[PDB]
């Protein structure tokens, strides 16, 4: 079942696939999960915010 | 609002 995403915290690759670390709205870091990029079609804006942030810091 | 499936399983 589906939940609200507060933000994207980080990203990584494993096994040739990209995953993103999600802060779930209304929960704390103890509940943070890694999610396959495929699960995140409805997280356009939070993904972009994250990507821009990473780009800013380089 | 931003939404997604939460993974409750994973590597064992």
Domain assignments of chain A as residue spans, ordered by start:
1-58
Query: Structure solved using which method?
Result: X-ray
Residues of chain A in contact with residue B7, where contact means CB-CB under 8 angstroms, are 33-36, 39
Long-range contacts of the stretch A41-49 (C-beta < 8 A, 24+)? A42/B2, A42/B3, A42/B4, A43/A5, A43/A8, A43/B2, A43/B3, A43/B4, A44/B2, A45/B2, A46/A5, A46/A6, A46/A7, A46/A8, A46/B2, A47/A8, A47/A20, A49/A7, A49/A8
For A1-58, CATH gives: 2.40.50.40
Mutate to test the interface with B, among A5, A24, A51 (most CBs of B within 10 A): A5
Out of A1, A34, A45, name the one closest to residue B2 (CB): A45
Number of inter-chain CB pairs under 8 A, A vs B? 41
């Amino acid at each position: 079942d589906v939940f609200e995403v507060e933000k994207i915290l980080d990203m990584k690759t494993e096994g040739g696939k990209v995953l993103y670390k999600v802060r779930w709205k209304g929960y704390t870091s103890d509940d943070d999960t890694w999610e396959p990029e495929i699960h995140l079609e409805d997280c356009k804006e939070v993904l972009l915010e994250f990507r821009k942030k990473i780009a800013e810091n380089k | 609002k931003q939404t997604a499936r939460k993974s409750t399983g994973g590597k064992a």
